[PDB]
Amino acid sequence: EPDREKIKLLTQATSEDGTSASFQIVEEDHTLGNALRYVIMKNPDVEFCGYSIPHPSENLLNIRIQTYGETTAVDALQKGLKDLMDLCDVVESKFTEKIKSM
Amino acid sequence: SNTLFDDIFQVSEVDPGRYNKVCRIEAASTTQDQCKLTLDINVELFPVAAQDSLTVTIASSLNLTRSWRPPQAGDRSLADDYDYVMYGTAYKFEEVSKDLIAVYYSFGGLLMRLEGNYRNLNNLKQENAYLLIRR
Amino acid sequence: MIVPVRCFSCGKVVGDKWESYLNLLQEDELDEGTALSRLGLKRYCCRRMILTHVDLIEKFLRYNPLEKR
Amino acid sequence: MEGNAQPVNFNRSWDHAYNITFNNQDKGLLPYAIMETANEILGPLEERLVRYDNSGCLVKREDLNKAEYVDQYDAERDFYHSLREYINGKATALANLRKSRGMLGLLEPPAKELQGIDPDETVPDNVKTSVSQLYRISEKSVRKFL
Amino acid sequence: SNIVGIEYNRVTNTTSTDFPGFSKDAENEWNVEKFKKDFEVNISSLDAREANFDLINIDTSIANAFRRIMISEVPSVAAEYVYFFNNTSVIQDEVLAHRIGLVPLKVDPDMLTWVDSNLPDDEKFTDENTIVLSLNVKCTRNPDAPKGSTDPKELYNNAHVYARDLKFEPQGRQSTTFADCPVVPADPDILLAKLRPGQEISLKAHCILGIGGDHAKFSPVSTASYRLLPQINILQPIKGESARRFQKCFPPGVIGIDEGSDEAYVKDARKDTVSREVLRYEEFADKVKLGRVRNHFIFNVESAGAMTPEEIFFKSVRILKNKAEYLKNCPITQ
Amino acid sequence: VKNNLLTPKSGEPIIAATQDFITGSYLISHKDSFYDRATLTQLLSMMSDGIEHFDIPPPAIMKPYYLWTGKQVFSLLIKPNHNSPVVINLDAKNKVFVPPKSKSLPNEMSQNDGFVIIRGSQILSGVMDKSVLGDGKKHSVFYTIL
Ligand SMILES: [Zn+2]
């Protein structure tokens, strides 16, 4: 049932303690990479958040998150996704309130 | 304590030629006649005008993973009472004449030539250093 | 040979403005620059769709093979 | 070839050797020490290139540079001579600035007493540190360059 | 600052600078309460085919994500397969099929199911995932025609095959689900083909739903775009005839002249398309400064007629949220 | 391709930066190019496809904001982290070199960043152009690395 092919942790690029990691995401492009970069970069514990599309022919996205020693990169990625969900919920609520107002 | 050099300079000219954010200023030391300074400064962050006095100091550390971590907010450093702090490497000590040497610093591509008697520039040791400038 | 259904650049449907454009130039005697503005074509990418269109369908239909010419 | 019709670029190699062997705790070398290190490295290389005449016997020292005794090893000898001349130029610059700072320029090897050099007549804080700043050629640097 | 400055030769301060690590203060940490307090939406116009609304105090990445999702990720219904019976037109079959696929259809995408591609063609199309449109046009010479007429609409009967000729054929339960909302093209005046006597078109189009990234015919927006709010700062007063010249450097409704002091002032910077004409003249140097607010976006979403633009924007926000949720729920494989 | 980076006509590089790569490198290394940490990190992920590990150096400007110069970006391009063994030192002139005001001043004190100096792996002066990243010159970065 769970999608094991969606997001992968590239072992050849990660760190021993999990502080630095690189994730490969399938069927994604700039429209999520840029938002994840902006949200994760707002985490005080993250010093390196950056995404790349290695080839336009491949629907693929590599995102690298390197942190300090307080939190791992997986926790940073999960927190960034949760904060992106919260941002979308806030935008949705404000938009529907303004549509219902007028 | 960590201050290798400290002197007050008077700016004689500003050359903004072919550039929109970085200006090459030339300054003469008021206290010492021999010391002169040629420095590249981001003019947008630190606006410099002609005939403006400014204090220049060179320090080894601002204290009173391997990637760089910012200092925590609320700590006390030498940068608190300065307006423009730069980080760079000394890569060249040369001689102009007797009793007069020139030191070259590069703060990631922005240059500084500091010329003066080797008695005053005895503390520069060809290493990484902070350049603190105050108006 | 016939007017495109959609503007190439943005995607606005300009295929339904051709007959109205021809009517505006023929009947109302408006200039070409005002007829385009009257049809809602503000972006220049849509304006060049029916300002540069060569209607070759009428010339090709002169040689119909299923009816004497 | 990495130079202007030369097998090696001397300036870039010297800068590379100085940078990759940089150490602020390493004591600098006097010019005669630099020349001695260069001679120790380059001696057996040009001493194995013995010059033979056309007959097949050794050539006397008084006529080593004659035209009729030119061999196929003259390029290597010229390269070694140029390398020694470059190292001697660096040592000469160091000796000249040592002379300019009111010190003894030991371009030539000193006498046999070897009781120490510049112990007290040279001011420690003022003029040792200056010549240490402007030129500090270590044994590791010259060995790596060679 | 948050003002993208506009100069005569370059554009300055274009990158967002709200994150810890930009300064020693370590501020602008992500707080959902601060974002909820600061974010604003202002609707300026809401028609059936066009919406104009300002998003205030939001980052550029999220607005660009909304734009990209509206363009290429919001599904809509367009013709995908065309089956031809006796296409006698001078227009080729491929061209006619492409034109029919390019028309917009007024179908709510929520009423259709995605088509499973790996299924065989015998059972790929069901009544829940396919809309069948029938076209049948024959052109005959008009007997009761004017003697000296040259118009093709009077010499012939069906010389123009339009988009409104695409009749809707219900299949199965679509006879009940599509009872109150029949399938019609959003632009019935689209000129699909031209005919002459003896020529005939007869075809059946199977229409499915897809995303705009696969093909541009599935994009539900004519254009979805944003522009930053312009900002004109008059640093020193501009008086007299020069003020009139200062009025001619901008669109007419942008900058006006006060009756009392006879000095120019900005009246409506929204109308100011940035043509930067005022920076050409040396007299207005060190008197006017132009910029754009970096966190003030003016979305102008024009729909293709399938559904309302506000629904498109809401679906884009929902799609971004669902992407984030799906990535959050997925396990990470080594 | 890796073993044929130099033409045998003169030994100069032939596989190097071309048009639209020299211009982008010049605009990155231009003196008024200052990047914050977000832009720096994005650029570093852009050159490595989100694979390589990058050790962020301390910024060139610290008090008003934290800004990195594009020369530091190219220093990271040459040497990403401490595990990388690439340490190259070179001094070279650009295509357009305007000499400094006084002849006693060295070449790095020139206008328009004419002289490029790389020590360790850090770029201390100059802009990257066809003379430093392109073909036809024996003082280029890629030639030194090779
Ligand atoms: Zn258009």
Return the CATH number at E193: 2.170.120.12
Domain that holds residue E60: 29-75+217-334
Pair type for strands E332-333 and E288-303: unpaired
CA D143 to chain centre: 10
Residue positions forming the annotated binding site of C for Zn(2+): 7, 10, 45-46
Question: Which residues in chain B have Cβ-Cβ distances shorter than 8 Å to F108?
Answer: 92, 104, 111
Which residue of C13, C57, C69 is the best one to mutate when testing the E interface, meaning the one whose CB has the most E CBs within 10 A? C13
Give the Å distance between the CA of C13 and the centre of ligand 1: 8
| Whether residue E62 sits in one domain with residue E132 | no
Q: Shortest CB distance from A102 goes to which of E46, E59, E73?
A: E46
**Boundaries of every domain in chain A:** 1-102
Give the Å distance between the CA of E225 and the centre of ligand 1: 13
Measured in angstroms, the CA of E59 and the nearest CA of chain B are apart by 24
Return the CATH number at B31: 2.40.50.140
Q: How far apart are CA C21 and CA C24, in angstroms?
A: 5
Pair type for strands B53-59 and B128-134: antiparallel
What is the end-to-end Cα distance of chain C in Å, rounded? 21
Cβ of D133 within 8 Å of Cβ of B124? The answer is yes
Which residue of B97, B110, B128, B131 is the best one to mutate when testing the F interface, meaning the one whose CB has the most F CBs within 10 A? B110
- Angle in degrees, CA E284, E286, E289, rounded to 5: 85
Q: Chains with ≥3 Cβ pairs under 8 A against B?
A: A, D, E, F
> In this structure, what DSSP letter does residue E91 have?
S
| Whether residue E327 sits in one domain with residue E243 | yes
Q: Shortest CB distance from B98 goes to which of D24, D100, D129?
A: D100
With b for 16 or more beta-carbon neighbours within 10 A and e for fewer, the D71-103 pattern comes to eeeeeeeebbeebbebbbebbbebbebbeebeb
Q: Determine the residue of chain E that is closest to C63 in CA distance.
A: E90
Rounded (10°) CA dihedral F66, F69, F71, F73? 60
Give the Å distance between the CA of E167 and the centre of ligand 1: 28
| Whether residue E66 sits in one domain with residue E102 | no
Q: How far apart are CA F96 and CA E207, in angstroms?
A: 62
CATH class for the region spanning A1-102: alpha beta
Secondary structure class of E222 (helix, strand, coil): strand
Q: How many domains does chain E have?
A: 2
Picking from E169, E186, E165, the residue whose alpha carbon sits closest to that of residue E307 is: E186
> In this structure, what DSSP letter does residue A70 have?
S
Measured in angstroms, the CA of A73 and the nearest CA of chain E are apart by 12
User: Which residues, including other chains, have CB under 8 Å from residue E308's CB and lie 6 or more apart?
Assistant: E48, E51
> What experiment produced this structure?
cryo-EM
Domain that holds residue D103: 1-146
Domains of chain C: 1-66 (1.10.10.60)
Say if CB F107 and CB F93 are below 8 A apart: yes
3-state helix, strand, coil in chain D (%, to 5): 55, 0, 45
Distances (CA, A) of A76 to A18, A33, A67, B5, F9: 11, 14, 8, 43, 54
Q: How many domains does chain B have?
A: 1
Secondary structure class of B110 (helix, strand, coil): strand
Any CB–CB contact under 8 A between E74 and chain A? no
Question: Which residues in chain D have Cβ-Cβ distances shorter than 8 Å to F144?
Answer: 12
Residue A101, Cβ density class (10 Å: 0-12 exposed, 13-18 middle, ≥19 buried)? exposed
Picking from E226, E61, E328, E224, the residue whose alpha carbon sits closest to that of residue A32 is: E61
Say if CB E62 and CB E189 are below 8 A apart: no
Resolution (A): 2.7
Say if CB D103 and CB D118 are below 8 A apart: yes
Give the Å distance between the CA of C48 and the centre of ligand 1: 8
Give the Å distance between the CA of C6 and the centre of ligand 1: 8
Question: Which residues in chain F have Cβ-Cβ distances shorter than 8 Å to D1?
Answer: 11
Cβ of A66 within 8 Å of Cβ of F53? The answer is yes
Cβ of B126 within 8 Å of Cβ of D97? The answer is no
Residue F109's Cβ-side half-sphere holds a number of Cα atoms within 13 Å equal to 21
Any CB–CB contact under 8 A between F138 and chain D? yes
Is E20 part of any domain?
A: no
Residue D27, Cβ density class (10 Å: 0-12 exposed, 13-18 middle, ≥19 buried)? exposed
The token pair at A60 is 């693929």
Secondary structure class of A60 (helix, strand, coil): strand
| Whether residue E128 sits in one domain with residue E44 | no
Distances (CA, A) of E63 to A36, E52, E57, E68, E325: 13, 14, 11, 9, 19
Cβ of F45 within 8 Å of Cβ of A20? The answer is no
3-state secondary structure A5-30: CCEEECCCCCCCCCCEEEEEEECCCH
- Residue identified by tokens 């012939």 is E156
Q: How far apart are CA F138 and CA F144, in angstroms?
A: 8
Residue F14, Cβ density class (10 Å: 0-12 exposed, 13-18 middle, ≥19 buried)? middle
Query: Which CB contacts under 8 angstroms, 24+ apart, belong to E94-97?
Result: E96/E192, E96/E193, E96/E201, E96/E203
User: Which residues, including other chains, have CB under 8 Å from residue E175's CB and lie 6 or more apart?
Assistant: none
Give the Å distance between the CA of E48 and the centre of ligand 1: 19
Q: How far apart are CA B10 and CA B18, in angstroms?
A: 24
3-state helix, strand, coil in chain E (%, to 5): 25, 30, 45
Any CB–CB contact under 8 A between E36 and chain B? no
Q: How far apart are CA F15 and CA F143, in angstroms?
A: 10
Say if CB B104 and CB F108 are below 8 A apart: yes
Q: Determine the residue of chain A that is closest to F39 in CA distance.
A: A50
Q: Which of E162, E187, E216 is the last residue of a domain?
A: E216
